[PDB]
Design an enzyme around this catalytic site. Structure first.
Site, PDB file in Angstrom:
ATOM      1  N   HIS E  97      38.726  35.655  47.889  1.00  0.00           N
ATOM      2  CA  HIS E  97      38.442  37.067  47.656  1.00  0.00           C
ATOM      3  C   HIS E  97      37.087  37.246  46.981  1.00  0.00           C
ATOM      4  O   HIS E  97      36.336  38.175  47.305  1.00  0.00           O
ATOM      5  CB  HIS E  97      39.567  37.681  46.820  1.00  0.00           C
ATOM      6  CG  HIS E  97      39.315  39.093  46.393  1.00  0.00           C
ATOM      7  ND1 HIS E  97      39.299  40.147  47.279  1.00  0.00           N
ATOM      8  CD2 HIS E  97      39.098  39.627  45.169  1.00  0.00           C
ATOM      9  CE1 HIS E  97      39.067  41.269  46.621  1.00  0.00           C
ATOM     10  NE2 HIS E  97      38.940  40.981  45.340  1.00  0.00           N
ATOM     11  N   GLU E 100      34.469  36.830  49.632  1.00  0.00           N
ATOM     12  CA  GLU E 100      34.404  38.038  50.447  1.00  0.00           C
ATOM     13  C   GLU E 100      33.615  39.129  49.736  1.00  0.00           C
ATOM     14  O   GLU E 100      32.792  39.819  50.347  1.00  0.00           O
ATOM     15  CB  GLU E 100      35.807  38.544  50.773  1.00  0.00           C
ATOM     16  CG  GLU E 100      35.818  40.018  51.135  1.00  0.00           C
ATOM     17  CD  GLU E 100      37.159  40.665  50.929  1.00  0.00           C
ATOM     18  OE1 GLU E 100      38.125  39.942  50.638  1.00  0.00           O
ATOM     19  OE2 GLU E 100      37.243  41.904  51.043  1.00  0.00           O
ATOM     20  N   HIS E 101      33.865  39.303  48.437  1.00  0.00           N
ATOM     21  CA  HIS E 101      33.158  40.340  47.693  1.00  0.00           C
ATOM     22  C   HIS E 101      31.663  40.054  47.619  1.00  0.00           C
ATOM     23  O   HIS E 101      30.845  40.966  47.780  1.00  0.00           O
ATOM     24  CB  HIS E 101      33.745  40.478  46.289  1.00  0.00           C
ATOM     25  CG  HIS E 101      34.819  41.515  46.183  1.00  0.00           C
ATOM     26  ND1 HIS E 101      34.689  42.778  46.718  1.00  0.00           N
ATOM     27  CD2 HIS E 101      36.040  41.477  45.599  1.00  0.00           C
ATOM     28  CE1 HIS E 101      35.786  43.472  46.473  1.00  0.00           C
ATOM     29  NE2 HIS E 101      36.622  42.705  45.796  1.00  0.00           N
ATOM     30  N   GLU E 170      29.764  40.483  39.515  1.00  0.00           N
ATOM     31  CA  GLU E 170      30.952  40.390  40.356  1.00  0.00           C
ATOM     32  C   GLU E 170      32.174  39.976  39.550  1.00  0.00           C
ATOM     33  O   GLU E 170      33.278  40.474  39.784  1.00  0.00           O
ATOM     34  CB  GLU E 170      30.709  39.402  41.495  1.00  0.00           C
ATOM     35  CG  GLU E 170      30.124  40.027  42.745  1.00  0.00           C
ATOM     36  CD  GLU E 170      31.103  40.938  43.452  1.00  0.00           C
ATOM     37  OE1 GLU E 170      32.321  40.679  43.375  1.00  0.00           O
ATOM     38  OE2 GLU E 170      30.655  41.916  44.085  1.00  0.00           O
ATOM     39  N   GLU E 177      38.961  45.273  39.018  1.00  0.00           N
ATOM     40  CA  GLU E 177      39.810  45.566  40.171  1.00  0.00           C
ATOM     41  C   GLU E 177      41.173  44.888  40.062  1.00  0.00           C
ATOM     42  O   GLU E 177      42.153  45.389  40.625  1.00  0.00           O
ATOM     43  CB  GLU E 177      39.117  45.165  41.474  1.00  0.00           C
ATOM     44  CG  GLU E 177      39.008  43.680  41.715  1.00  0.00           C
ATOM     45  CD  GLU E 177      38.597  43.355  43.133  1.00  0.00           C
ATOM     46  OE1 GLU E 177      38.237  42.189  43.399  1.00  0.00           O
ATOM     47  OE2 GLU E 177      38.635  44.266  43.983  1.00  0.00           O
TER      48      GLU E 177
HETATM   49 ZN    ZN Z   1      38.980  42.978  47.126  1.00  0.00          ZN
END
Ligand code: ZN
Ligand code: CDL
Ligand code: CDL
Ligand code: 3PE
Ligand code: 3PE
Ligand code: 3PE
Ligand code: HEM
Ligand code: HEM
Lengths: 49, 460, 386, 117, 487, 51
Positions: E97, E100-101, E170, E177
């Site tokens: 993940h 991906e970010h 990030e 998140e």
């Molecule tokens: Zn995500």
């Protein structure tokens, strides 16, 4: 400090420890033992009949 | 049977399609009584049949307030020819979905399934629309449901604020609330709904729109059923004159200590609606130019994170929750505005910033050529990507045949999009700014500024 | 409401059984000392069935009773099994109820809010004693005759009404056929009253739930009854059946006196008259006094103290685990009660008079002492606090 | 049926007169004798009727029960202003039972089931 | 003497009711011509015609698939990768993940702002999403911009570069998140279900991973992940809309270079570390929440297992229910009818998940803490009556529903490209609609009973519940209710 | 049920902006915020001798 009861809700780990002071577990991967259970229980249902 | 990695042996494969298939054309046909049938051919194995009526929220006298919400809710239920059990069973037997929607100007009934069930779809939809029997106990159950719904509908501040804007800014017929009020929820029954439907569901206000059906088969199926409706002159449309106003109402005082944010909006009015196509398209391009943001969204980058609003507000004042521009074009009338959310310590500053930004858009020479080109490209790309689904094409055919009477090809809209320039957006924005202000607020009302002083910050 | 049926076990027909047997909430740390109530219920059922089948072959007359019992044992298919089950199941039933009572004494189950349960239990105990004593007569042996004589003539020690009530009880001038037939009818009747009292006892307990080996509030961690305590009851029942059948099949006369195989003869007296093994504490307390009125009216304090335990109202901790001194007193009381039991079966001379007069004193000092710990320990939080 | 019809058969007329007399005595209608505990379809039929009709039914039942307790009958004038055999329940009952049958044909489950007593 | 039938306030209303009921009765035949509520099986060979999917395998093992329709005006181009959070190493758990970010910032040739302004000036946008076994990066664009979009995709996948400041930014945004997602208490349910059913295996972990692991996710780890798990044979390129296969294949062959040639496939990495189903429970009791939520799951099939179609039919015939649905209490299935007639739950939905070499199958209801016993009874009763007394009408209706769903969901260019990519990774081939049908209508009552007696009858379960669950039956209740003593 | 006092409070809210705009009949948030310590501190601070 965060409560002990809430740190276990937002942390869905998959490594779980049970209480082996009484009952041991089979190693993960081994089949079930339902048939042996019926085997043991029929030997007493005979006697009760 | 073999595993799915190995093909089944005894199947028969129909031949494929060519890589180039010339798309069909919309064939529009009207019956003598005014019933308009429209259809279009498609390539996918699925169909989509809709039924759209010109009735809506505006056709609502004060004794029948709240009727449209129930007319949406009593959508596919006991008809004169079959029960609610049988309707649900038929729909689930063929495997199709079904849905209904109601807005301020037009009603929409949709029904889609696979393409080999077209006659059943047409027949069932026409029956559920043309011959409804309103049974008191079903209506009572729906009324209980809507009571529970409206009692708890205070979790959406966005639509509540938009309704407040549309209620304060208008005075005539268009000021009614599409969502109903507790008076209506204690005044509605079966007889009212039956009379409303009998009065407003005439022939010249109904159009059939299909997405993947040959015109001749659909016409053959739907000619014996709809041709019998009597013809009647259409009643004249009601009117509403724009009148700048203000709205305020504090939240329930059990939710103030939680630091509930402050919400408000501004608004303006456009003399043109959808009949002035160039003005409406310029307004759409302007709206896509302003863009906005949410500070929490995680969707596509192409949503406009390099738009005017995002860069020049959120990256400059981080205190904001959410800024976004909105518009709602109607028939013969339009709306524009900005909705903003921020804490209870930046409010009047937010009003100053937003009025400054509107006036910056108004004055000539403030928009870069790159900005206009990007807005044009984004608008046309959004339109074309919207037009992919069958639901969208059926809805588009129905709405357009209602409004203009004929479908306007996408090429025409693209041409009108390309004609946009700086002077046109300047003049249109000048017409926006030359109108009285509408405002409303929500949350902690006790801090929002006055109407008159903010109004004086603008032109006439 | 549930406008369509879900289960047979929640319908009105089976609501009572379901709610009070299957879904009833119980503490999850109950030990094996909580099975003896069910075990005693099964013992009562065994007694009733075996008796209803013995009473098809027994004739209540002085000429025929002994010979009819022997006819049952010698001439009816399996009749010896019926008689041995009955005559030994009485003993099993008394054993189980004694263990039940001492469980109740240990974890202090009589206190609030469970004193109605204790009082109904005491009444049940009285009915049990009366039933067993009345039913030890119908075989009409030597001990039947002379035990009936002694015990039922112990009721003329009361002032003026004495001789009148004794003569009315005996139906005549001596223990004879009228007393036999009377006692047979009473014996056939009393166990159904025992059943009714048992059901009332259970309802009174279920209106507040049971205690636990901790004596604390227990409403946060409970489990249903089935299948978690059904299987534990099953273990108990099978062990009990093994024990009962060891008694029936390989030693069926160890728990009785040999003299009841001699037909009743009113002229000669046996040299050593005693009742069954489960009346010897009362019998020793009763003969411990050198006075008839005092001896008879010393049983009344026993039942008054047993019936007035629950109403002392200062003790705050129930279980004896956190009460060392009361625990020691419990064990010492148990030893003294066994000593009374052993003394109740001895001749009355030295050195048994002193050892028969002191244990009653201890048996009453138990019911006198316990409120004193109540008071002296009500103020314990204020001294030991940290 | 033919012989159940009053206007042809000639008993049937006597049967109708006897029943009407017995119902007019206590001032209640033939549809009152139905019971929501018997069928559970009467329960639904009465759960769908408007409130005024059910209220009139309840008032009539209470009046008749008071009369029966007191061992007396309505006066002759209120016995003249009576009209039994004016139904309010038969059509709704037929509708509910017909819907029940049609639901039984196409699988499904019943909407209400009696309790096991 | 009696009042006329209109002289009293109740006689008038009774007469009105009777008049309406007469209005309701007699039907019109001309509206009853084509419809019928009794399900029957149909033959859809006249409409299943679709443009051909043309698959090409380059000499590097890479696969390129298209679906060329030259009449449209927009195209979708993307990359489907055979990687996920399952193939990590218990120390780098959230790396997929995170990668991906951060994939959308680097590309030293192009800084972030210039790339984002390209794509926004282009008119199209590109998304991403990762799971335990399939990651994706795809873009929607216009017809003229396909080469530009494919060039962007190749550059971002092949020439990515990471920097420390971006890493810290990030890291903080992903902590934020993680704190954002713990509030909808349904992905929590399914994360705990996946972490209890598969404890001590790869599938037991979570896609986002620990915070105590995101603390130390430094750049070399990202580089190692890229060089280890993005290999040419394991990647798939797909496209739909207004494209041509030859143009895409030549551009790809010219552009896609510098990829690591590791001779490792997914077969070896799954052959060891298999997925074993244990059977257990997790109970989270809170009691300050107004609603309770739980899921109970059996074990399921795999992708290539010939029984997945039967399991899909079973899921269709144990359908979902919600308090806002128009079906109400006439909703076809049996568990839905019980839940809706007796008002026992808020909502429920039968689910079915497939992995390579294992799967799941369950119910997942939502209810108040007063109705849990009836809810669980109905759930288990219907689940087992599946294996005892399946009927013909139910199976025909389930087959029709499954056909209609599987075709209606394929609508638009993005769904078509997603379909092609995922079916080229899971099956190794894209199955034409004709074979889907020919396999679906070959699952009758006997096969339903056979598969049910293979998967449901007398097998272990996994549960997970949250909220006021003090009134939820214990494990032994559920475990015993998976067989019947009547039969 | 008492529109007269409601209008009086509304007038004292809208027509004023300083201290005289404070609410007299309280609202739910302060009610959720009040306890013993708040009232104790209020009384200790404001019930002085000269007043
Ligand atoms: Zn995500
Ligand atoms: C039709 C509906 C049937 C139903 O509802 O089933 C309920 C239930 C099973 O329900 P289920 O959920 O369908 O079955 C799930 C399990 O697999 C069921 O498995 P289970 O564990 O419940 O079965 C265990 C059971 C298996 O046996 C049976 O249930 C069938 C027989 O074992 C026994 O019954 C033991 C017999 C008891 C005799 C013990 C006597 C004590 C001492 C005797 C005197 C000693 C002197 C010598 O049946 C039982 O549990 C049986 C309960 C029996 C207890 C009755 C107590 C009798 C005591 C009276 C004796 C007094 C002495 C007389 C002289
Ligand atoms: C009174 C006489 C009636 C007794 C039976 C009542 C039955 C009520 C009932 O519905 O239960 C079924 C009930 C079925 O549960 P369910 O909620 O309907 O659903 C279960 C499944 O559907 C699957 O379960 P199911 O529905 O298939 O099982 C119900 C029944 C199937 O019933 C039927 O529908 C067929 C009816 C018979 C036709 C076949 C011939 O099947 C059986 O019972 C198999 C028994 C084998 C035949 C033996 C005869 O079984 C249980 O839940 C377990 C109950 C266990 C009872 C043990 C309680 C003992 C604990 C306290 C012991 C006290 C200590 C005693 C010492 C004191 C001395 C005085
Ligand atoms: C052998 C000859 C025997 C002859 C009889 C001898 C009797 C000796 C008994 C001596 C013991 C003293 C008994 C005193 C009883 C009442 C004492 C008492 O405390 O009652 C009060 C209490 C509730 O009152 P409270 O709330 O505490 O006071 C409020 C103050 N503001 O009340 C309660 O807490 C309610 C408790 C009710 C439970 C006890 C009920 C009576 C016992 C039941 C057994 C009887 C059943 C018999 C069944 C067959 C009948 C023939
Ligand atoms: C113990 C219960 C009391 C039984 C009892 O005392 O009976 C004695 C007597 C009844 O019998 P009784 O009068 O002695 O007959 C002889 C006639 N010359 O008693 C009586 O005369 C009347 C008994 C009334 C009291 C019964 C109490 C129970
Ligand atoms: C509540 C407790 C109730 C218990 C009731 C019975 C208590 C014991 C009754 C008994 O009699 O046990 C003593 C037993 C009899 O001995 P026995 O030989 O029959 O008498 C002399 C005649 N030759 O002689 C025995 O030693 C048998 C063992 C019985 C249990 C132990 C008795 C404790 C006291 C023994 C040592 C003093
Ligand atoms: C036929 C005779 C008896 C029967 C059938 C019987 C049965 C029961 C049963 C079934 C229970 C509940 C289950 C359990 O806790 O084991 C119980 C509880 C109890 N019984 Fe009895 N019993 C009898 C005699 C007695 C006697 C003689 C006493 C006291 C002198 C007594 C005192 C109690 C007490 C104090 C409890 C409370 C249980 C607790 O603390 O949890 N019982 N009885
Ligand atoms: C309906 C219930 C009962 C009936 C019909 C019944 C019947 C009988 C009969 C006919 C006898 C004489 C047969 C013989 O002595 O061998 C007897 C003896 C006896 N009964 Fe019962 N009985 C019942 C219940 C009980 C109960 C509940 C108990 C004890 C709690 C009990 C205790 C005794 C005793 C101890 C004997 C003495 C037998 C001996 O020692 O030889 N009975 N019973």
């Amino acid at each position: 400090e965060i409560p002990a009861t809430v740190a276990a809700v937002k942390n869905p780990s998959s490594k779980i420890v049970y209480d082996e002071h009484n009952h041991e577990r089979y190693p993960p991967g081994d089949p079930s033992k339902r048939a042996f259970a019926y085997f043991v229980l029929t030997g007493g249902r005979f006697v009760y009949a | 049977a073999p595993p799915l990695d190995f093909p089944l042996p005894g199947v028969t494969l129909p031949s494929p399609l060519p890589d180039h298939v010339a798309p069909g054309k919309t064939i529009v046909t009207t019956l003598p009584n005014g019933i308009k049938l429209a259809s279009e051919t498609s390539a996918g194995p699925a169909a989509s049949i809709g039924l759209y009526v010109d009735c809506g929220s505006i056709y609502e006298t004060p004794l029948t307030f709240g009727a449209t919400h129930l007319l949406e809710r009593m959508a596919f239920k006991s008809t004169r020819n079959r029960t609610h059990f049988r309707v649900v069973r038929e729909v689930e037997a063929i495997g199709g979905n079904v849905q209904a929607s109601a807005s301020r100007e037009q009603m929409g009934y949709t029904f889609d399934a696979l393409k080999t069930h077209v006659p059943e779809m047409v027949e069932l939809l026409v029956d559920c629309v043309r011959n409804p029997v309103f049974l008191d106990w079903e209506v009572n159950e729906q009324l209980l449901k809507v009571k529970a719904e409206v009692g708890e509908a205070s979790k959406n501040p966005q639509d509540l604020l938009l309704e407040a804007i549309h209620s304060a800014g208008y005075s005539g017929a268009l000021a009614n609330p599409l969502l109903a009020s507790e008076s209506a929820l204690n005044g509605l029954n079966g007889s009212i709904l039956e009379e409303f439907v009998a009065e407003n569901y005439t022939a010249p206000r109904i159009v059939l729109a299909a997405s993947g059906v040959e015109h001749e088969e659909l016409l053959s199926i739907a000619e014996p059923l709809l041709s019998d409706l009597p013809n009647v002159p259409r009643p004249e449309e009601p009117k509403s004159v724009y009148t700048g106003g203000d709205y305020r109402c504090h939240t329930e005082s059990g939710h103030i200590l939680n630091g509930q944010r402050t919400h408000f909006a501004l608004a303006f009015e456009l003399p043109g609606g959808w009949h002035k196509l160039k003005d409406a398209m310029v307004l759409t391009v302007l709206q896509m130019l302003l863009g906005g943001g949410g500070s929490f969204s995680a969707g596509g980058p192409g949503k406009g994170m390099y738009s005017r609003l995002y860069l020049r507000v959120l990256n400059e004042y981080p205190q904001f929750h959410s800024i976004s521009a909105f518009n709602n074009i109607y028939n013969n009338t339009g709306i524009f505005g900005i909705q903003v959310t921020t804490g209870s310590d930046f409010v009047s500053k937010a009003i100053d910033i937003t009025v400054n930004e509107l006036l910056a858009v108004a004055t000539s020479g403030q928009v870069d050529q790159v900005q206009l080109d990007r807005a044009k490209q984004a608008t046309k790309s959004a339109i074309l990507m919207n037009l992919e689904s069958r639901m969208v094409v059926s809805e588009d055919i129905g709405r357009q045949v209602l409004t203009y009477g004929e479908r306007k090809p996408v090429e025409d809209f693209l041409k009108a999009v390309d004609e946009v320039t700086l002077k046109d957006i300047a003049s249109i924005s000048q017409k926006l700014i030359s109108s009285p202000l509408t405002m409303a607020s929500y949350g902690d009302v006790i801090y929002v500024p006055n109407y008159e002083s903010v109004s004086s910050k603008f032109r006439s | 409401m549930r406008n369509q049926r879900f289960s047979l076990l929640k319908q009105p027909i089976s609501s009572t059984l379901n709610q009070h047997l299957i879904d009833y909430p119980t503490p999850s740390n109950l030990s094996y000392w909580w099975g003896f109530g069910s075990l005693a219920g099964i013992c009562l059922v065994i007694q009733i069935v075996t008796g209803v089948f013995l009473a098809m072959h027994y004739t209540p007359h002085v000429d025929l009773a002994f010979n009819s019992v022997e006819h049952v044992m010698r001439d009816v298919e399996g009749g010896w099994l019926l008689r041995y089950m009955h005559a030994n199941g009485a003993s099993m039933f008394l054993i189980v109820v004694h263990l039940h009572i001492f469980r109740g004494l240990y974890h202090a189950s009589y206190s609030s809010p469970r004193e109605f349960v204790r009082c109904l239990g005491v009444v049940i105990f009285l009915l049990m004693i009366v039933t067993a004593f009345t039913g030890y007569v119908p075989p009409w042996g030597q001990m039947s005759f002379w035990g009936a004589t002694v015990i039922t003539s112990l009721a003329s020690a009361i002032p003026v009404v004495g001789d009148t009530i004794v003569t009315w009880l005996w139906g005549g001038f001596s223990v004879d056929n009228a007393t036999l037939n009377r006692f047979f009818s009473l014996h056939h009747l009393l166990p159904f009253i025992l059943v009714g009292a048992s059901l009332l006892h259970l309802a009174a307990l279920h209106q507040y739930g049971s205690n636990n080996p901790l004596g604390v509030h227990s409403e946060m961690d409970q489990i249903s009854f089935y299948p978690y305590f059904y299987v534990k009851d099953l273990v108990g029942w099978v062990a009990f059946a093994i024990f009962f059948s060891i008694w029936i099949f390989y030693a069926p006369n160890v728990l009785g006196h040999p003299d009841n195989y001699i037909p009743a003869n009113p002229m000669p007296t046996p040299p050593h008259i005693v009742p069954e093994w489960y009346f010897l504490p009362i019998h020793a307390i009763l003969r411990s006094i050198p006075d008839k009125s005092g001896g008879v009216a010393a049983i009344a304090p026993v039942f008054i103290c047993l019936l007035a335990l629950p109403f002392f109202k200062s003790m705050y901790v129930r279980s004896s685990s956190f009460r060392p001194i009361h625990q020691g007193i419990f064990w010492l009381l148990l030893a003294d009660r066994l000593l009374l039991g052993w003394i109740g079966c001895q001749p009355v001379e030295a050195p048994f008079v002193t050892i028969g007069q002191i244990p009653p004193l201890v048996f009453f000092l138990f019911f006198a002492i316990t409120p004193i710990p109540g008071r002296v320990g009500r103020g314990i939080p204020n001294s030991y606090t940290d | 049926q033919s012989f159940i019809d009053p206007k042809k058969n000639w008993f049937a007329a006597q049967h109708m007169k006897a029943i009407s007399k017995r119902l007019r005595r206590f001032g209640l209608r033939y549809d009152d004798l139905y019971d929501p505990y018997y069928d559970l379809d009467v329960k639904e039929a009465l759960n769908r009727l408007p409130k005024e009709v059910v209220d009139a039914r309840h008032q009539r039942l209470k009046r008749a029960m008071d009369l029966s307790m007191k061992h007396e009958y309505l006066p002759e004038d209120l016995q003249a202003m009576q009209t039994p055999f004016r139904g309010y329940l038969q059509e709704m009952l037929a509708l509910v039972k017909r819907e029940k049958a049609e639901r039984e044909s196409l699988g499904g489950l019943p909407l209400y089931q009696r309790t096991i007593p | 003497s009696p009042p006329p039938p209109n002289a009293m306030v109740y006689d008038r209303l009774a007469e009105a009711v009777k008049a309406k009921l007469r209005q309701l009765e007699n039907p019109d035949p001309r509206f009853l011509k084509y419809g019928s509520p009794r399900p029957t099986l149909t033959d859809h060979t006249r409409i299943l015609a679709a443009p051909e999917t043309r698959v090409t395998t380059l000499p590097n093992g890479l696969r390129v698939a298209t679906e060329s329709s030259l009449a449209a005006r927009t195209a979708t181009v993307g990359v489907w990768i055979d990687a996920g959070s399952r193939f990590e190493t218990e120390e780098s758990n959230g790396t997929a993940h995170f990668l991906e970010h951060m994939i959308f910032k680097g590309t030293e040739k192009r800084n972030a702002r210039e790339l984002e302004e390209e794509i926004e000036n282009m008119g199209g946008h590109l998304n991403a999403y990762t799971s335990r076994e399939q990651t994706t990066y795809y873009a929607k664009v216009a017809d003229k911009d396909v080469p530009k979009a494919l060039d962007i995709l190749a550059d971002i996948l092949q020439n990515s570069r990471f920097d420390e400041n971006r890493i810290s930014r990030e890291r903080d945004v992903i902590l934020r998140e993680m704190e954002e997602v713990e509030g909808q208490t349904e992905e929590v349910i399914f994360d705990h279900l996946h972490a209890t059913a598969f404890q001590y295996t790869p599938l037991g972990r979570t896609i986002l991973g620990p915070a105590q692991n995101i603390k130390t996710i430094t750049k070399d780890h990202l580089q190692n992940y890229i060089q280890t798990h993005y290999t040419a044979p394991r990647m798939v390129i797909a496209a739909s809309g207004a494209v041509k296969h030859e143009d895409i294949v030549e551009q790809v062959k010219k552009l896609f270079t510098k990829l690591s040639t590791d001779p490792t496939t997914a077969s070896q990495l799954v052959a060891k570390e298999p997925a074993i189903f244990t059977g257990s429970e997790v109970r989270m009791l809170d009691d300050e929440i107004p609603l309770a939520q739980f899921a109970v799951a059996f074990e399921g099939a795999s992708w290539k297992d010939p029984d997945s179609i039967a399991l899909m039919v079973m899921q269709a015939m144990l359908g979902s229910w919600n308090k806002t649905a128009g079906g109400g209490k006439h909703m076809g299935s049996e568990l839905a009818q019980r839940v809706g007639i007796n008002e026992v739950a808020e909502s429920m939905m039968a689910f079915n998940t497939n992995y390579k070499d294992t799967g799941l199958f369950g119910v997942y209801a939502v209810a108040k803490p007063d109705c849990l016993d009836d809810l669980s009874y109905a759930i288990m009763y219907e689940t087992t009556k599946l294996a005892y007394r399946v009927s013909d009408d139910d199976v025909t209706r389930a087959r029709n529903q499954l056909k209609s769903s599987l075709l209606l969901y394929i609508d638009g260019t993005s769904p078509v490209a997603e379909d092609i990519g995922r079916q080229l990774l899971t099956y190794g081939r894209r199955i034409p609609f004709a074979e889907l049908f020919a396999r679906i209508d070959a699952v009758d009552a006997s096969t339903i009973k056979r598969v049910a007696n293979r998967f449901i009858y007398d097998k272990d379960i996994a549960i997970a519940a949250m909220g006021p669950i003090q009134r939820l039956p214990d494990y032994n209740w559920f475990r015993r209710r998976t067989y019947w003593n009547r039969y």
